[PDB]
């Protein structure tokens, strides 16, 4: 249930296992050969943490279907030993000296196991198999053909993702080893009540406030009170929390923050906020989905350079190392689960009995609601203590208007409200074609988050006509008395393509696209957020509509800016975080 | 019927009218205002010859629907005066001092008019209106929606071309003024019979051979005979023909050439030929479809640089200035008519009565067969005396497998055979999906010219699977005992996009694409031609599948080479013009 | 003296400190304010390991002059604790709880310190200051103006490097914490003698062979003997060495390899070798000089993709994590020291007394010979047990033909021979203009490694004339009876710049450049190596001659290939590792 971010404490070690491991692609005849027992033979090398897909050469390597084998030797005994894999994508089986230890369905969330039992003296063998297969039982969801069918599924077995990004798999995030005394802290939970005319509830499970610079303060289930400094967007401030328990210490950073909705207003510390930012990705070269601390810190600089404040974990939980990094710098975050691809209208929907299949058919449709719940639990049981997180996104672009939509998301929306000790807003982002009167999110989500492409997929290159449809659909969402946010809107743009009389795919059309849309966003006082799609270019599956990946980014994959990054930087320079609307 | 290329002769003048004219966009209220009478007011400037679409700034200008007005003053009287417009795209009305003189339906072929009658002393006014509307009655054919529908036709009137290139319109080719004595030559026709062990038939209508360097020779309906030097691909040689008649002189260059088919062999002077080249376009910046003598001469250099010999006038007759230029340099040409777009399966076919419309429906389909015939006449009545022309293409990618296909093209195929005093091969290039047993060209065309995209539109990015389909369809065409030529095969490629593990749209995939295809072409001895698509990048209508136009070219629009231009140059260096197959 | 690469063993921990730290730029008033005592205030964030220069926005940040402050909290006691900084660039002062602990001059080599004494119970403070100033007393060497003076040194203080790459500084390589029993292994040294018709000497300081797959074997100052499997380029094989001593274990991988020179032959296991490869850099975005395990493993793939075998640590020792990675994959390495910039002819040489200064003037010249020696010691005392290392490079492009050249490098050449328990070849790479009769390396180095640019800096764009000079200078080096290797030759090339008639900076000129040079290399049987410059594009200081950095790479900075990467891949495909010359 509960995972705490490991760190050097007076009671706990932290031995990182990151490095170059032994690696082998499964050829089917792998598990019967019991490769997990003896050290890998004819093994190649692969760094950890990283996605393997882009680190060796060849289509047969990048597009491999099935299992891969990471191997590594280990050595160390009086303390509780535990092996936390920060993330394995997607499925993982952790052998050790041949004997299985753990399994995990879940590609972008951490899990730990006990280590004292089993284990030996030294020179014992660690093996981790990773599977990449996605289908109707996985999150993210894999289909049975290409997503952009509006290449035939033939011959060789492969993964056909129901999502517009590449299936970067492997040990994406680090593998560490921390220790604990036989009695340990297992979870911390701290809350806040502010008197805007400053008390911190703080349950624990199996304590001293500290202030930013370190000047120690109050001491003590717990509770506190002080004259506090507010955590603000682009103005962070983190108190420290030193938990002293059964001869064990874990330190915790906390920010004082209040989020609630008052109709058409998103309140951050009782002020009228405005989202300025992007949908992002964990996408670099050549790490793929692997973690890249430099690029994380680098994008933060660019975002402050570009006068932003927000972004969304599209379309999966990010790294712990980044969420904390968003606490330090004061970046508003919209956290999101792995629930993308819950939509069987993409491409040609599956056809069991000669007729199309709805998304939530009980027999031939999505079979994810169970695993969907654990993800909501494990995610909120991880990021509950981040002031950067002001909202949860239960899913990206699902069939939120089909039979079964409401009855699918209702229990998930409630589980979200039940487990967040702060009662944060919850939402899902809506596909195009979804209207206010037909969306299961119109009476379920506290804010309306839209993904609309008026002037690109729908209406391009006629920007006059596309503007009419955008206004028509936007006036129709105002009738909910809820806030409306745009989480995706963009236009593919190849860097270096120009013209004075702009056509599609040029840097000039990309600016005119955003000029038209933002001109309409400003006409409505219930729009409390513009989030561009995308922050940077990123890799996808191969298709005719994908020019070496998704070029909708404001920046390139090497983070170099396009002409639109300078448009948004000038625009977002004169738009405040608070009171842009009032 | 007959048009002779004007040139300075002892009897004939030639005053070019090319320059900057007065120009105005029609606003509807134009013909009732009788703008053709008084000189244009509030007029802009436009060079002639050129396509206007790209020479001024603005979508409303580039995408104008309707008429444009060229205006110009003229002045000079004992001779027959005549105004030949080398090409106006598409429809033209030639006023003069307000009084109409001529009209022409036909966008890429010349026409002339008489000038002595009417005309005045000096400072008389010339006005030329040009229309750009295309529909089911035009060649090329315009539809009722975008061509790549596998943007909604809405609100504003526009042209929706049924072809993958831009509707560059205006006075594309020059406007000149030549004079003749009241008795003039109107047509010349010269033929050849070679004894490959050398006689020239030469009718005239209302004469001395001359040899290349100018050493005069035989003299004289006519006839000649000599020990000749053969016109060969990449080895040209043009005799001269000085027609001396009723005090009038017209000089004519001629080449001695023999073309015929002996089963799976294309015979040029009784030798087994092989087409090495491209499908080309009249496409430059910013002239559009306008004539560009430098680029013409420049591409010829590149083609000899790249070790080619052939190309096709895709998809319209080119300039006279280029065809003669192909005679001088020895470039094999496949001449083609304006018949592209005769296919109503593109996009979503029109739907008159709730059900789709076949291409050759008598009531709701193509209405071009009449104008189709005149184009075949006017084209062959123009390019009949070019040794570079070794074949006629009656149409590009038509519905050559639908009801009405045969009965449509049969009279056109015959008119082609009737009017060519050399009995050259005739063909049409076939859409993808057309097979040997279903194509009206399988028993109509003397050679099979295919446009196939195995590995791009159909099968990409799986080059293994795409190879199987290409072999399967190619073995199935061999059973005709006719030669097979590829006139289109390519892959969109953005210059500067690279990867070692190649994906689509990169320069590396483009090479692998051609590597797979050419590997299969060589496996079959009935393939007598590979012609790449395209020679250079060129502009199209705006679509999601068109990244600033058609990037399938080996070169860029400014003629800079891609990595594939160097692949083909190395490949075509070791492939001869003759005997590659035998 | 001796540093062993830390790793999890039965006796030793390894707690990585990599992560996001507190960071502050010195403003002068820093050390007097004793920032090292109290935790940093107004602190920004910076990941470790990384070069800070590119992770925040602004010229004033990227081009900062002076100190930066890394800060971090630490916690843990029965074992010997030690803090090894794998590399700090350039100078480092390691405070802890305010009390200084260590200092290190040396930017690209590791150092460790003792930790038991001092240190506290928990929540004690670690501070690391890093300096970036380079001058005549540093390696690399910093000058007093820009290097490409054939921008005036004015106003603001800055660093003016005497080398063509950027001054990426900071904690480039990781910071870890390992423990040892009070008695520990401090150094291992293993040697080999092969009977080519297989004995391993193995001293230790304060033991069981193991075979690749792990099948244990012989046991035992030591010695061994077996029927061995040879470590070969592109065919690696690493035995394991488990040192069991005073209750302490350290494991060591070893390869059986023999290197010696027999006149014009470089012998690797008594076979005639040929270097196929590049000069490389530790240069990625945005890590700068920071370590990037994915890119390391990625380049190895590309090198095997491109059919290479060798490369050079230009111009500094690389990471331990990469050298071991070169042992696993079988990549020949030419190890190099930080000795670049020992040349005061670059730009305008310094002018103390109105007249130029020679490089090795005792009073106003290079003052590095002392620190130069320690670098040779610390480097060979680190990489002595890598089979990938077949040579040491004492310096890059120094004034190897000026007064003082010989007397400077002589003691360094000897120290190199004294401390390598394998007697590997030693060399330095020579500037252009250096000839055989004038180079202190002509009678000092066992192999002649040249950096020549015939056809670029010297002779471009005339490739005929440049070829004559290259042959003339190459015939003149053959008269030494020593092997000749090219370590640098290239031409700046902007990706995407093309022409059929090639000019400088195009992808075509770059190929013709290498075509001319390699045509001459093959004409001489004493050339035993071609190494391109560079492997990839990389960042430099700003100059008119530097188009966003050094574009001489075969690949781009994001590792995408240029047209020349495919030239070398086809060339190196038919050139073996052995017997290309014989």
Q: Where do we find the tokens 């007697």?
A: C423
Specify whether the CB–CB gap between A397 and A357 falls below 8 A: no
Two structure tokens written together for B448 = 């099979």
DSSP-derived 3-state class of residue A150? coil
Q: Do C297 and A55 touch (CB under 8 A)?
A: yes
Q: Where do we find the tokens 């244009």?
A: B40
Q: Do B504 and A459 touch (CB under 8 A)?
A: no
How, if at all, do strands A19-25 and B19-25 pair?
Answer: unpaired
Q: Report the 10 Å Cβ neighbour count for A215.
A: 8
C-alpha span between A122 and A73 (Å, rounded): 9
Residue (of C573, C569, C575) closest to C528 by Cα position: C575
Q: Do B562 and C498 touch (CB under 8 A)?
A: yes
How, if at all, do strands C187-190 and C199-205 pair?
Answer: antiparallel
Residues of chain A contacting B61 with CB distance shorter than 8 Å: 501
Please check whether residue A27 touches B, CB under 8 A.
Answer: no
Listed in sequence order, the residues at least 6 apart from A197 whose beta carbon sits closer than 8 Å to its beta carbon are none
CATH class of C182-258: mainly beta
C-alpha span between A19 and C293 (Å, rounded): 8
Residue (of C65, C149, C54, C207) closest to C557 by Cα position: C54
Does domain B259-582 fall under CATH 3.20.20.80? My reply is: yes
C-alpha span between A92 and A234 (Å, rounded): 38
SS (H, E, C) A466-496: HHHHHHHHHHHHHCCCCCEEEEECCCCECCC
Residue (of C320, C217, C312) closest to C4 by Cα position: C320
Residue (of A566, A535, A539, A569) closest to A552 by Cα position: A535
Q: Which of B494, B504, B548 sits opposite A503 (nearest CB)?
A: B548
Where chain C is discontinuous (C–N > 2.5 Å), the residues before each break are 76, 150, 197, 206, 220
Query: Quick one: DSSP state of residue B467?
Result: H
Q: In 3-state terms, chain B is what percent helix, strand and coil (to 5)?
A: 20, 30, 55
Chain A nearest CA to B459, separation (Å):
5
Q: Do B58 and A501 touch (CB under 8 A)?
A: yes
Nominal resolution (angstroms): 3.0
Specify whether the CB–CB gap between C391 and C352 falls below 8 A: no
Number of residues in chain B: 582
Number of residues in chain C: 582
b/e sequence B153-174, b meaning 16+ C-beta within 10 Å: eeeeeebbbbbbbbbbbbbbbb
Q: Do C561 and B495 touch (CB under 8 A)?
A: no
What's the alpha-carbon Rg for chain A, to the nearest Å?
24
Listed in sequence order, the residues at least 6 apart from A358 whose beta carbon sits closer than 8 Å to its beta carbon are A344, A349, A365, A399, A402, A403, A404
Q: Which of B151, B501, B546 sits opposite A58 (nearest CB)?
A: B501
At CA C331, angle to CA C300 and CA C193, rounded to 5? 160
C-alpha span between C425 and B182 (Å, rounded): 94
Residues of chain B contacting A457 with CB distance shorter than 8 Å: 544
Cα dihedral A93/A96/A97/A101 (nearest 10): -80
Q: Torsions phi, psi of A102, nearest 5?
A: -150, 165
**Residues paired with residue A47 on neighbouring β-strands, in sequence order:** A20
Q: Where are the alpha helices (DSSP H) in A44-156?
A: 59-62
Listed in sequence order, the residues at least 6 apart from C315 whose beta carbon sits closer than 8 Å to its beta carbon are C140, C163, C165, C336, C338, C340, C396
- The number of C-alpha atoms within 13 Å of A123 and in the hemisphere containing its C-beta is 13
What are the Cα distances from residue C428, in Å, to A354, C106, C141?
A: 74, 20, 16
* Dihedral sign computed on CA atoms, order C318, C320, C322, C325: positive
Residues of chain A contacting C18 with CB distance shorter than 8 Å: 16, 293
- The number of C-alpha atoms within 13 Å of B99 and in the hemisphere containing its C-beta is 8
DSSP-derived 3-state class of residue B288? strand
Please check whether residue B542 touches A, CB under 8 A.
Answer: yes
Q: Which residues of C are catalytic?
A: 397, 488
Q: Do B498 and C561 touch (CB under 8 A)?
A: yes
Q: Report the 10 Å Cβ neighbour count for B100.
A: 13
Chain C nearest CA to A54, separation (Å):
8
Residue (of C457, C451, C454) closest to C469 by Cα position: C454
Evaluate the omega torsion of the peptide bond into residue B84 and state whether it is cis, within 30 degrees of 0.
no
Specify whether the CB–CB gap between B175 and B49 falls below 8 A: yes
C-alpha span between B543 and B526 (Å, rounded): 37
Q: Do A544 and B460 touch (CB under 8 A)?
A: yes
B residues 234-273 near A, CB within 8 Å? Answer: none
Q: Report the 10 Å Cβ neighbour count for B420.
A: 18
Listed in sequence order, the residues at least 6 apart from C317 whose beta carbon sits closer than 8 Å to its beta carbon are C108, C109, C335, C336, C337, C338, C379, C382, C383
Q: Which of B59, B460, B501 sits opposite A59 (nearest CB)?
A: B501
Q: Contacts from A103-108 at CB under 8 Å and sequence distance 24+?
A: A105/A138, A105/A371, A106/A338, A106/A371, A106/A374, A106/A375, A106/A378, A107/A139, A107/A140, A107/A169, A107/A172, A107/A316, A107/A338, A108/A172, A108/A316, A108/A317, A108/A338
DSSP-derived 3-state class of residue A2? coil
Two structure tokens written together for C307 = 């059919």
Characterise C334 by phi-psi region: left (phi > 0), alpha (psi -120 to 50), beta (else): beta
DSSP-derived 3-state class of residue C231? coil
Specify whether the CB–CB gap between B507 and B562 falls below 8 A: yes
Residue C392, Cα to own-chain centre: how many angstroms? Answer: 10
**A131 membership: H or E segment, kind and range:** strand A122-131
SS (H, E, C) A7-55: CCCCCCCEEECCEEEEEEECCCCCCCCCCCCCCCCCCEEEEECCCHHHC
Could you give the maximum distance between any two Cα atoms of chain A, in Å?
73
C-alpha span between B411 and B408 (Å, rounded): 7
Number of residues in chain A: 582
Beta-strand runs (E) in A132-207: 175-180, 187-190, 199-205
C-alpha span between C367 and C342 (Å, rounded): 9
Residue (of A541, A160, C525, A181) closest to B461 by Cα position: A541
Would you kindly state where each structural domain of chain A is located, as residue ranges?
1-181, 182-258, 259-582
Preferred mutation among A39, A286, A323 to probe C, highest tally of C CBs within 10 A:
A286
Query: Quick one: DSSP state of residue C496?
Result: T
Q: Do A548 and B494 touch (CB under 8 A)?
A: yes
Residue (of C70, C59, C58) closest to C25 by Cα position: C70
Q: Where do we find the tokens 């509770």?
A: A223
Q: Which residues of B are catalytic?
A: 397, 488
C-alpha span between A283 and A292 (Å, rounded): 9
Our answer to whether residue A397 is catalytic in this structure is yes
C-alpha span between B118 and B121 (Å, rounded): 10
Query: Quick one: DSSP state of residue A454?
Result: B
**Residues paired with residue B89 on neighbouring β-strands, in sequence order:** B170
Q: Contacts from A201-205 at CB under 8 Å and sequence distance 24+?
A: A202/A241, A204/A243, A204/A245, A205/A2
Residue (of C464, C486, C491) closest to C474 by Cα position: C486
At CA A48, angle to CA A43 and CA A52, rounded to 5? 65
Please check whether residue A157 touches B, CB under 8 A.
Answer: no
How, if at all, do strands B310-312 and B332-336 pair?
Answer: parallel
Does domain B1-181 fall under CATH 2.60.120.260? My reply is: yes
Listed in sequence order, the residues at least 6 apart from B213 whose beta carbon sits closer than 8 Å to its beta carbon are none
Is B287 labelled as part of a ligand binding site? Answer: no
C-alpha span between B451 and B534 (Å, rounded): 12
C-alpha span between A39 and A22 (Å, rounded): 9
Q: Torsions phi, psi of A357, nearest 5?
A: -110, 125
* Dihedral sign computed on CA atoms, order C272, C277, C281, C286: negative
Query: Quick one: DSSP state of residue C137?
Result: T
Specify whether the CB–CB gap between B175 and B71 falls below 8 A: no
Specify the experimental method.
X-ray
Where chain A is discontinuous (C–N > 2.5 Å), the residues before each break are 76, 150, 197, 206, 220
* Dihedral sign computed on CA atoms, order C212, C215, C218, C222: positive
C-alpha span between A425 and A372 (Å, rounded): 18
Residues of chain C contacting A555 with CB distance shorter than 8 Å: none
**Residues paired with residue A578 on neighbouring β-strands, in sequence order:** A273
C-alpha span between A527 and A480 (Å, rounded): 12
Q: Do B560 and C499 touch (CB under 8 A)?
A: yes
Looking at chain A, which subunits does it touch, using at least 3 CB pairs closer than 8 Å as the criterion?
Answer: B, C
Chain B nearest CA to A153, separation (Å):
10
Specify whether the CB–CB gap between C49 and C172 falls below 8 A: yes
C-alpha span between B7 and A578 (Å, rounded): 76
C-alpha span between C193 and C201 (Å, rounded): 8
Evaluate the omega torsion of the peptide bond into residue A534 and state whether it is cis, within 30 degrees of 0.
yes
Q: Which of C302, C500, C565 sits opposite B561 (nearest CB)?
A: C500
Preferred mutation among C497, C498, C509 to probe B, highest tally of B CBs within 10 A:
C498
Two structure tokens written together for C40 = 């940093």
Specify whether the CB–CB gap between C55 and C172 falls below 8 A: no
A residues 318-377 near C, CB within 8 Å? Answer: 321, 324-325, 328-329
Residues of chain C contacting B302 with CB distance shorter than 8 Å: 500
Closest chain A residue by Cα to residue B547: A505
Residue (of B13, B3, B15) closest to B248 by Cα position: B13
Please check whether residue A47 touches C, CB under 8 A.
Answer: yes
Closest chain C residue by Cα to residue B298: C500
Q: Which of C305, C500, C561 sits opposite B305 (nearest CB)?
A: C500
Residue (of B90, B112, B110) closest to B101 by Cα position: B112
Listed in sequence order, the residues at least 6 apart from C117 whose beta carbon sits closer than 8 Å to its beta carbon are none
Looking at chain C, which subunits does it touch, using at least 3 CB pairs closer than 8 Å as the criterion?
Answer: A, B
Specify whether the CB–CB gap between B47 and B55 falls below 8 A: yes
CATH topology match: A182-258 vs A259-582:
no
C-alpha span between A490 and B71 (Å, rounded): 44
Q: Torsions phi, psi of B468, nearest 5?
A: -65, -45
- Span between the terminal Cα atoms of chain C, in Å: 41
Preferred mutation among C299, C500, C571 to probe B, highest tally of B CBs within 10 A:
C500
Q: Which of C495, C500, C560 sits opposite B499 (nearest CB)?
A: C560
Where chain B is discontinuous (C–N > 2.5 Å), the residues before each break are 76, 150, 197, 206, 220
C residues 477-506 near A, CB within 8 Å? Answer: 496
C-alpha span between C236 and C330 (Å, rounded): 5
DSSP-derived 3-state class of residue A284? strand
**A393 membership: H or E segment, kind and range:** strand A389-396
Q: Torsions phi, psi of B416, nearest 5?
A: -65, -45
Closest chain B residue by Cα to residue C507: B563
């Amino acid at each position: 249930n509960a995972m705490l971010y490991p760190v050097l404490t007076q009671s706990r070690l932290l031995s990182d296992l990151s490095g170059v491991w032994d690696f082998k692609l499964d050829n089917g005849k792998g598990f019967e050969e019991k490769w997990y027992e003896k050290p890998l033979k004819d093994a190649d090398t692969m760094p950890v943490p990283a996605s393997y897909n882009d680190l060796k050469e060849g289509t047969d390597f990048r597009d491999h279907y099935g299992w891969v084998f990471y191997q590594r030797n280990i050595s160390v005994k009086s303390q509780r030993i535990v092996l936390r894999c920060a993330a394995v994508t997607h499925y993982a089986m952790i052998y050790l000296n041949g004997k299985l230890i753990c399994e995990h369905k879940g590609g972008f969330l951490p899990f730990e196991v006990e280590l004292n039992d089993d284990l030996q003296d030294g020179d014992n063998l660690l093996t981790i198999a990773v599977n990449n297969v996605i289908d109707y039982t996985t999150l993210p969801v894999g289909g049975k053909a290409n997503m952009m069918s509006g290449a035939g599924a033939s011959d060789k077995p492969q993964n056909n993702p129901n999502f517009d990004f590449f299936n970067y798999c492997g040990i994406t995030r680090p593998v560490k080893i921390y220790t604990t005394p036989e009695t340990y802290i297992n979870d911390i939970t701290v809350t806040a009540d502010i008197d805007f005319t400053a008390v911190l509830n703080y349950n624990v499970e199996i304590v001293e406030l500290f202030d930013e610079e370190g000047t120690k303060l109050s001491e003590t289930g717990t509770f506190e009170i002080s004259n506090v400094r507010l955590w603000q967007p682009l103005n962070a401030y983190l108190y420290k929390i030193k938990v002293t328990a059964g001869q064990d210490v874990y330190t915790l950073p906390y920010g004082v923050r209040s989020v609630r909705v008052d109709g058409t207003k998103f309140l951050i510390n009782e002020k009228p906020f405005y989202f300025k930012g992007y949908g992002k990705h964990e996408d670099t070269f050549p790490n793929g989905r692997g973690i890249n601390l430099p690029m994380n810190t680098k994008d933060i600089s660019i975002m402050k350079w570009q006068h932003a404040n927000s972004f969304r974990t599209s379309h999966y939980p990010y790294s712990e190392e980044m969420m904390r990094l968003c606490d330090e710098e004061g970046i508003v975050v919209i956290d999101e689960t792995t629930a993308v691809g819950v939509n069987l209208q993409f491409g040609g929907g599956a056809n069991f009995g000669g007729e199309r299949i709805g998304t939530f058919d009980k027999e031939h449709g999505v079979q994810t609601q169970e695993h969907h719940k654990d993800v909501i639990r494990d995610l909120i049981s991880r990021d509950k203590n981040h002031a950067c997180v002001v909202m949860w996104s239960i899913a990206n672009e699902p069939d939120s208007a089909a039979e079964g939509a409401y009855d699918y998301f209702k229990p998930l929306y409630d589980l979200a409200r039940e487990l967040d000790p702060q009662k944060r807003p919850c939402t899902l982002v809506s596909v195009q074609g979804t209207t206010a009167d037909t969306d299961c999110s119109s009476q379920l989500s506290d804010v309306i988050c839209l993904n609309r492409y008026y002037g690109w997929y729908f209406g391009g290159p006629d920007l006059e006509v596309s503007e009419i449809g955008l206004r028509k659909e936007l006036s129709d969402w105002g009738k909910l008395g809820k806030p409306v946010m745009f989480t995706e809107y963009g236009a593919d743009t190849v860097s270096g393509l120009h013209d004075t009389t702009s056509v599609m795919y040029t840097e000039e059309y990309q600016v005119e696209y955003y000029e038209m849309n933002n001109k309409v966003f400003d006409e409505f006082d219930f729009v409390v957020g513009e989030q561009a799609w995308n922050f940077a270019d990123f890799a996808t599956s191969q298709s005719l509509l994908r020019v070496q990946g998704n070029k909708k980014g404001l920046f390139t994959r090497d983070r170099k800016p396009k002409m639109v990054a300078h448009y948004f930087r000038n625009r977002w320079s004169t738009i405040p975080e608070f009171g842009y609307k009032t």
